[PDB]
Amino acid sequence: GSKAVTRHRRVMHFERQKLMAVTEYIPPKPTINPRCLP
Amino acid sequence: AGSQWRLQQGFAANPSGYGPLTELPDWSYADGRPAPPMKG
Amino acid sequence: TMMQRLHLFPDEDIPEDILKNLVEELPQPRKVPRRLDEYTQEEIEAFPRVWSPPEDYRL
Amino acid sequence: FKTLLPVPTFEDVAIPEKPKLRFVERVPLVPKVRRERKNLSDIRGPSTEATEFTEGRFAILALGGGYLHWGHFEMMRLTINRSMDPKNMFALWRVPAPFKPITRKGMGQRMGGGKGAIDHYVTPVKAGRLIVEMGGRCEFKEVQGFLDLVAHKLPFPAKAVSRETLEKMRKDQEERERNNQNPWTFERIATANMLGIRKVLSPYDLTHKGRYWGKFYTPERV
Amino acid sequence: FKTKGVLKKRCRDCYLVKRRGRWFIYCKTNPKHKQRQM
Amino acid sequence: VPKTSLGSPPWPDIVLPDPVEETRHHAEVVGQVNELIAAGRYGRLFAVVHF
Amino acid sequence: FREVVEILDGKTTIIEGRITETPQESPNPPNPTGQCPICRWNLKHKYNYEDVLLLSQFIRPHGGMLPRRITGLCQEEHLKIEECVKMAHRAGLLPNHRPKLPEGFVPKSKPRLNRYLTRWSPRSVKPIYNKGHRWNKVRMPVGSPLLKDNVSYSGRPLLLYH
Amino acid sequence: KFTRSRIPDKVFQPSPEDHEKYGGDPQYPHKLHIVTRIKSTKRRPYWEKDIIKMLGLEKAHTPQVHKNIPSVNAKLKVVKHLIRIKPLKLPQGLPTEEDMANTCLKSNGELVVRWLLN
Amino acid sequence: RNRIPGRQWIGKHRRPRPVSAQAKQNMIRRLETEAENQYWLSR
RNA sequence: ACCAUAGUAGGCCUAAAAGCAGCCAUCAAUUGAGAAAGCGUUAAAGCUCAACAAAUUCACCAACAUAAUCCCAAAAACUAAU
RNA sequence: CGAUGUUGGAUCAGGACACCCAAAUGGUGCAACCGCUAUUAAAGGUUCGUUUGUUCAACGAUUAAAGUCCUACGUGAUCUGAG
Numbered sequence: 017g018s019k020a021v022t023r024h025r026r027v028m029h030f031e032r033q034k035l036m037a038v039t040e041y042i043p044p045k046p047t048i049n050p051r052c053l054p
Numbered sequence: 055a056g057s058q059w060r061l062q063q064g065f066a067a068n069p070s071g072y073g074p075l076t077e078l079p080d081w082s083y084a085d086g087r088p089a090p091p092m093k094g
Numbered sequence: 095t096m097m098q099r100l101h102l103f104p105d106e107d108i109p110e111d112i113l114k115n116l117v118e119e120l121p122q123p124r125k126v127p128r129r130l131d132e133y134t135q136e137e138i139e140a141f142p143r144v145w146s147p148p149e150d151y152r153l
Numbered sequence: 154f155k156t157l158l159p160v161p162t163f164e165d166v167a168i169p170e171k172p173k174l175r176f177v178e179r180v181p182l183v184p185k186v187r188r189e190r191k192n193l194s195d196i197r198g199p200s201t202e203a204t205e206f207t208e209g210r211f212a213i214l215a216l217g218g219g220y221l222h223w224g225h226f227e228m229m230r231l232t233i234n235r236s237m238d239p240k241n242m243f244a245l246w247r248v249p250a251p252f253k254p255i256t257r258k259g260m261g262q263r264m265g266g267g268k269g270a271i272d273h274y275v276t277p278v279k280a281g282r283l284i285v286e287m288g289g290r291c292e293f294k295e296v297q298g299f300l301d302l303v304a305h306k307l308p309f310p311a312k313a314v315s316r317e318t319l320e321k322m323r324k325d326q327e328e329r330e331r332n333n334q335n336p337w338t339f340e341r342i343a344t345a346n347m348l349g350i351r352k353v354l355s356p357y358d359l360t361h362k363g364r365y366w367g368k369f370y371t372p373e374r375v
Numbered sequence: 376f377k378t379k380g381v382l383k384k385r386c387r388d389c390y391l392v393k394r395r396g397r398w399f400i401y402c403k404t405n406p407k408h409k410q411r412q413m
Numbered sequence: 414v415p416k417t418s419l420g421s422p423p424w425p426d427i428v429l430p431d432p433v434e435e436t437r438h439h440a441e442v443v444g445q446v447n448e449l450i451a452a453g454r455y456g457r458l459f460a461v462v463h464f
Numbered sequence: 465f466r467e468v469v470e471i472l473d474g475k476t477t478i479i480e481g482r483i484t485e486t487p488q489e490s491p492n493p494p495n496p497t498g499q500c501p502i503c504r505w506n507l508k509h510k511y512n513y514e515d516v517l518l519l520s521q522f523i524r525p526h527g528g529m530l531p532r533r534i535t536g537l538c539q540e541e542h543l544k545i546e547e548c549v550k551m552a553h554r555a556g557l558l559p560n561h562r563p564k565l566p567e568g569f570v571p572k573s574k575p576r577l578n579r580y581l582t583r584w585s586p587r588s589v590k591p592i593y594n595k596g597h598r599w600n601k602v603r604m605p606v607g608s609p610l611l612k613d614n615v616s617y618s619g620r621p622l623l624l625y626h
Numbered sequence: 627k628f629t630r631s632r633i634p635d636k637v638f639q640p641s642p643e644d645h646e647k648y649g650g651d652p653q654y655p656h657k658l659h660i661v662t663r664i665k666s667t668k669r670r671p672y673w674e675k676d677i678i679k680m681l682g683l684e685k686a687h688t689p690q691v692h693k694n695i696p697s698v699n700a701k702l703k704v705v706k707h708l709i710r711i712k713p714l715k716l717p718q719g720l721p722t723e724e725d726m727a728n729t730c731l732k733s734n735g736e737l738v739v740r741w742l743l744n
Numbered sequence: 745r746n747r748i749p750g751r752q753w754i755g756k757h758r759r760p761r762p763v764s765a766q767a768k769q770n771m772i773r774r775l776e777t778e779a780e781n782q783y784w785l786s787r
Numbered sequence: 788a789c790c791a792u793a794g795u796a797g798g799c800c801u802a803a804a805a806g807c808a809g810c811c812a813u814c815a816a817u818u819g820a821g822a823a824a825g826c827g828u829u830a831a832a833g834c835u836c837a838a839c840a841a842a843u844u845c846a847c848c849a850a851c852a853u854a855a856u857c858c859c860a861a862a863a864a865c866u867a868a869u
Numbered sequence: 870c871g872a873u874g875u876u877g878g879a880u881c882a883g884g885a886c887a888c889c890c891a892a893a894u895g896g897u898g899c900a901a902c903c904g905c906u907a908u909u910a911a912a913g914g915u916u917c918g919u920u921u922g923u924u925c926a927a928c929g930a931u932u933a934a935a936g937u938c939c940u941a942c943g944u945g946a947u948c949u950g951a952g
């Protein structure tokens with residue numbers, strides 16, 4: 017049993033890792049790239 | 055498999071669910087008289 | 095047992111006793127890409143020129 | 154030929170007396186005789202105090218939690234004093250003197266037997282808390298240049314930010330969190346107890362919103 | 376040559392080149408400035 | 414029209430017959446099968462039966 | 465196209481520039497409103513190392529790359545096309561775009577190993593003797609990461625490390 | 627300490643687009659819930675086990691009909707992560723006493739009164 | 745060569761087993777189902 | 788890439804402080820150059836930056852070795868996948 | 870704990886490189902020789918004696934070198950019993 021705050025990054029539970037992966041940020045991607053757009 | 059397609063079409067997820075493959079009597083006498091009903 | 099049934103040859107030099115047994119040839123799983131010189135001139139001309147190089151530039 | 158631009162002029166900035174950092178004590182004048190339990194709540198979670206500029210225009214922003222002791226204080230003080238301009242720049246502390254005691258046991262002692270002996274004192278710092286705030290009639294490039302070394306030498310990750318930089322990063326974070334595409338978010342799932350995830354999660358996660366894990370803070374996790 | 380994790384130019388004549396899969400700070404005026412990214 | 418590796422899908426294009434022609438062909442096929450059944454030119458029959 | 469001609473006649477060197485006729489762009493692009501050449505010809509997220517006819521349009525006869533300020537491509541497509549040209553050259557495409565060395569073609573070496581979708585240089589990668597276990601595995605990179613945005617008709621992501 | 631989870635009332639405030647997305651009537655709420663237990667109660671708290679027991683969902687993948695009252699809605703909210711809930715649909719109306727033996731429940735969420743006529 | 749200290753899924757240093765796309769899709773499906781449930785449990 | 792001239796060694800202490808151990812002022816000439824932002828001399832001298840005149844792709848941070856019997860399924864960037 | 874025989878040595882050594890030599894190089898406050906560091910490379914070697922049971926330790930003579938470790942700080946169904 018480790019403490020709540022540790023130095024070794026405290027590897028998370030598998031369910032928490034899945035939750036983090038699902039809740040990862042998704043930037044809005046436009047249909048057409050505006051750089052070379054008119 | 056193919057459960058989502060059956061669910062969209064309205065059939066049961068399993069072909070054994072309330073389909074004609076199970077509700078109908080699976081056999082009958084050669085004379086045409088009805089067979090005894092199934093326990094299931 | 096199934097490895098003993100396998101025959102591997104570095105090149106297209108197969109003994110006749112093995113050649114006489116072949117039935118069919120399986121298709122290649124990967125399509126070999128063409129080289130630039132292997133493309134026909136009609137296809138090269140059909141493919142459009144995307145950009146126009148300036149005349150003043152030197153290659 | 155290049156176009157000239159007006160140089161920002163600092164006329165409303167007055168340098169106070171003793172612009173250099175004040176000397177700090179490893180042990181306070183009144184030592185704590187009673188040993189205290191090492192609470193980790195003073196590090197876990199975002200910082201509540203010293204989160205905004207008071208009089209300066211630049212600061213050392215900590216992106217994680219940690220402990221700052223007399224060695225770190227001396228390093229920061231000496232570096233800032235030797236790399237600052239006393240005539241045009243001034244600095245100020247944002248963290249207090251080391252007060253939380255740390256107990257240690259000598260090598261060869263088996264587990265138990267009571268609490269150890271107070272070895273040194275440390276100051277807890279949370280993520281988002283300023284450490285040193287500087288001001289003056291100077292630009293942002295040189296202060297960032299000579300404060301990045303201090304930020305790197307700090308235990309927790311840190312940056313040499315300004316008012317404009319802090320505003321820019323906070324606005325970018327808000328914009329990202331409001332234009333995030335996936336309908337599922339950590340805060341929403343934690344609040345709604347979706348999938349029964351409260352069993353795996355912690356009560357502090359409802360406030361941390363998945364941005365804080367232990368003492369580590371990830372600003373890119375919305 | 377000095378093997379380092381971070382390479383920085385010690386003068387204006389040092390140039391950074393990617394060779395053999397690594398980064399190299401090469402200096403001709405001061406040969407002591409030869410740095411190799413590990 | 415430019416022709417690249419990813420310009421076209423990597424599968425041959427499929428063209429389906431017109432619905433009217435398909436219905437007529439199906440009618441012809443079912444009529445032929447019905448004529449075969451009536452003439453009794455089938456020797457042996459197998460059946461998949463649920464029981 | 466400009467060519468430099470040098471003439472030697474009795475301790476006299478004459479250096480001259482000669483301008484030749486050059487091909488022009490096709491009259492009808494599918495998207496004339498696009499500023500970028502590829503982005504206006506609708507070849508974005510379409511080309512690859514296999515498409516040699518597009519990669520050969522703007523490259524030096526010795527296999528060198530062409531400046532973006534002269535080509536006109538956007539930065540991302542310029543980098544992607546540079547990667548594709550490097551991959552094709554390493555794989556063995558563009559056989560006629562190599563320098564002509566009369567002295568070096570006689571001493572033949574070991575036969576060129578067939579390769580494709582090569583990311584790094586052949587002479588700069590050390591073999592992986594450890595290869596890693598299941599959880600920590602040193603995967604072998606294949607293809608350029610700049611081509612991960614190409615259209616996938618099957619829909620499966622392109623494995624860039626295997 | 628891991629205890630019961632309070633669910634704020636903001637979660638159960640439907641958006642205008644939710645009705646169109648889920649095929650619900652914005653004006654009149656449905657009358658009966660069809661609940662089906664998807665996940666197991668193992669590795670789940672004992673209070674959730676007791677709720678699933680008192681809701682009559684012991685057998686998984688077997689639909690059960692319940693009222694649309696807040697008294698049962700509270701328990702459904704408590705164990706909402708283990709069940710699928712659908713609105714009961716009656717295209718042919720409530721079955722009478724003469725059609726009790728000829729009824730059926732289609733998987734789409736509707737109750738057919740006349741099933742397998744001859 | 746590469747050993748996992750302690751037990752495989754207990755100690756401070758655990759197996760670095762990552763999350764898969766199948767797991768992500770399953771979690772998304774479960775979240776959608778629960779969102780529909782909590783919508784139906786609103787009125 | 789492109790070049791670097793003028794009051795002037797600005798005024799004080801110091802054997803010397805000439806942009807450069809230090810302190811105070813920080814003006815003014817040529818369209819165009821700071822009593823000088825880095826090297827260098829005991830002090831100089833001398834070598835670079837920014838200022839004009841010549842063009843003008845983009846250019847802020849981010850890369851990090853290792854143990855012992857023998858590495859460890861093989862492999863695969865596109866035929867349609869809620 | 871219904872036994873995993875416990876230090877040093879004798880014999881045999883296996884392996885790692887965080888290399889002592891032997892090999893190829895870079896920088897040096899590298900003019901040359903002696904030197905100081907930095908990289909790669911482990912197919913091969915890494916002495917003989919006095920005192921101490923000694924591992925260590927100090928000393929004598931050399932060598933191109935008398936390297937650091939793991940191996941139940943290797944090896945007692947191979948040995949030695951000084952502690």
Ligand SMILES: [Mg+2]
Pocket residue numbers: 017018
């Ligand atoms: Mg615990």
Ligand SMILES: [Mg+2]
Pocket residue numbers: 304305306307308309310
């Ligand atoms: Mg740090």
Ligand SMILES: [Mg+2]
Pocket residue numbers: 748749750751752
């Ligand atoms: Mg183990």
Ligand SMILES: [Mg+2]
Pocket residue numbers: 748749750751752753754755756757758
């Ligand atoms: Mg473990």
Ligand SMILES: [Mg+2]
Pocket residue numbers: 816817
């Ligand atoms: Mg003037």
Ligand SMILES: [Mg+2]
Pocket residue numbers: 837
């Ligand atoms: Mg200049």
Ligand SMILES: [Mg+2]
Pocket residue numbers: 852
């Ligand atoms: Mg090393």
Ligand SMILES: [Mg+2]
Pocket residue numbers: 870
């Ligand atoms: Mg024992």
Ligand SMILES: [Mg+2]
Pocket residue numbers: none
């Ligand atoms: Mg025993």
Ligand SMILES: [Mg+2]
Pocket residue numbers: none
């Ligand atoms: Mg025994």
Ligand SMILES: [Mg+2]
Pocket residue numbers: 882
């Ligand atoms: Mg040996």
Ligand SMILES: [Mg+2]
Pocket residue numbers: 886
């Ligand atoms: Mg080595």
Ligand SMILES: [Mg+2]
Pocket residue numbers: none
């Ligand atoms: Mg040597």
Ligand SMILES: [Mg+2]
Pocket residue numbers: 911
């Ligand atoms: Mg050896």
Ligand SMILES: [Mg+2]
Pocket residue numbers: 942
């Ligand atoms: Mg030991």
Ligand SMILES: [Mg+2]
Pocket residue numbers: none
């Ligand atoms: Mg032993």
